[PDB]
Amino acid sequence: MISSLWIAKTGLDAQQTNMDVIANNLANVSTNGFKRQRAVFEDLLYQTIRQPGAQSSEQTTLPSGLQIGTGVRPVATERLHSQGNLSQTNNSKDVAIKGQGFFQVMLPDGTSAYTRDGSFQVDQNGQLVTAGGFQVQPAITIPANALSITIGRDGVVSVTQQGQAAPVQVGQLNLTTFMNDTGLESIGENLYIETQSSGAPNESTPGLNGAGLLYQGYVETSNVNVAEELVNMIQVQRAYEINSKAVSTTDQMLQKLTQL
Amino acid sequence: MISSLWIAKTGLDAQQTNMDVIANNLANVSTNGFKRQRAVFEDLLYQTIRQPGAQSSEQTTLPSGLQIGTGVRPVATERLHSQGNLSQTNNSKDVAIKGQGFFQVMLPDGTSAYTRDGSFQVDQNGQLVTAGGFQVQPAITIPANALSITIGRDGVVSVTQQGQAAPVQVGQLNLTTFMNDTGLESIGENLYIETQSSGAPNESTPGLNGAGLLYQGYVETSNVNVAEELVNMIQVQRAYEINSKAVSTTDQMLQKLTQL
């Protein structure tokens, strides 16, 4: 009913969105292959009223006329695709990425999703799957009597059987790189899918033209910096305070008009 | 919202960067051929509310006006390329450098990387490789029937075979020197790749125009000084706590302003 109240409401909603993003970032600290998110805001419409640059008088113009702005709105939340610090879990099936590539998995629907988390297991049939049971492609089949699984820097998966001095190659782990890495649609479950803003999936060998190197026994932890989150929590709390105070001040003004 | 808050926020990030540098230096104490890092900081923006030297009057000039400054920013993290202490492992395959040279190794991609690590091993094919399996170039191969590998102070590699009353030469080991060793980009595995700030790699014999000498049976330990790391730990902890206290002071001032 009054403009300042709508503007302050938009400010409150934006600050709540910022706090939601902060809480989501802090809730996924222990998640492997997680990237922290940051929201970016834009100011809302600007009421024209007096067009600046108009002729103030026959020989003079109006410098920077009367523009009344509306509130604020969030544009987008961008991920920070940076290499998190590696953690040694001493497991032959945990794989970490040193560069800028992704693992490809197949959803039950038949479509292909992409995940950076490398905590892998083996199913009852022998294929390498993720923690959610999704099959890593290209299919890597581990045979029944395996003694040790070796995954090299270039993505070759080898199995050393009993009594044979040579290792048997059973697959080849490739990495998919996208032109726009932040444009992927996150569906949860540490899974990102291709959108039209994320270019096209370019398959490549882990060590070639820009795919990262695969480390066995390592996991890529989240890149969330927690002290920054605490400081940003302080900032968000204070901003929400100030916006609520603006709402309360507008409430007090309308009261006097009602009393009139 | 408050400039003091932003300035403290930066200061906190700068001190966290210092802490991370110290932690990384301490984590690599026992690694051979390591160069400890050091961060350099610089002044951020300077708000010129009142210009220093402004002509306040036709006769008097304002000295040292209102130059309100912003926080701090780390210029870079430069590695200290100094000769670490030599240690005798007493192995024929261990080499150490005395001056400022680099060994050249070949990545699977075909490009050349540079290392100061001297722990060499022969592979199944007999070529000398580093601990990460990267082949030294220009390739030094060693035959199967070699009784002892002798690497001279000038880089001449020889072996004594059964019978052969004379030791045969199987190649020559050279060192690459750079104009600016600090600008080399570290990729891990004790490997540095050249950039445009590191000039060009100059190949030279170990004892010639300024490449260092080669000592056999010696290994170059890291140059990290533990006592300096602990003292810097204390100083960085105190500075970080004080910056956090500044953040708290700004928070309390904002709370008092809001409680109006």
Add this chain to the structure above:
Amino acid sequence: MISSLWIAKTGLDAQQTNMDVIANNLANVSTNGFKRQRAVFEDLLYQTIRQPGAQSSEQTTLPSGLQIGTGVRPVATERLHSQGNLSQTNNSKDVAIKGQGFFQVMLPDGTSAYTRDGSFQVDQNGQLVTAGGFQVQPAITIPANALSITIGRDGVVSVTQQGQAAPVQVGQLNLTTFMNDTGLESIGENLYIETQSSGAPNESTPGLNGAGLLYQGYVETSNVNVAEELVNMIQVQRAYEINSKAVSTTDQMLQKLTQL
């Protein structure tokens, strides 16, 4: 809308500016060659009302009439140009000034700034530059196959070549001194530009006319005294709280005036 509220606004602004000065000093504790700032405040206007000195009763003057004053405005921030503590880093490229001199650096746009930070680097062409890539004046050039760089206490630079037992002088490092060191305009990046309140640049070699002496392997740390900063926090907080209390009291007075 009421005088006391404007005066309290000015007081709040002054205390906030003091807080920015404190935060800027704190954020640059680890910055090499940093000088701490201090702000100076002055009284604002004084409304005349009854003129002090005007003759009442024909033969009796009026002493100390109604000089109702307005708030406070900060005059300027002045840097404390004192010698910071020297820290030994054992580097051939770190130079520390012990007296009252400045290094001259050329910005690529053509003009020259002045810096006290002595952490110098070598570009791919062999020139001595600042850590931000700015080429120090004069363009001391270092030969390719340098074994040791010696910067003497008189600013002379010597390089020890192989096969030459006598060092060869490759330059001369000078110090720039000013009439007024507080009048330099800080542009960030540890750089000062000359203003008309700082006189003109006086070149002098280190040891004569007053320029300081150059130490090799040492860095001039910041002169920020931190316990003083904490005590200044306590004041900058109470004073701000008290000014906010004055704002609140004026608000209550206006509220009762309105309500009647």
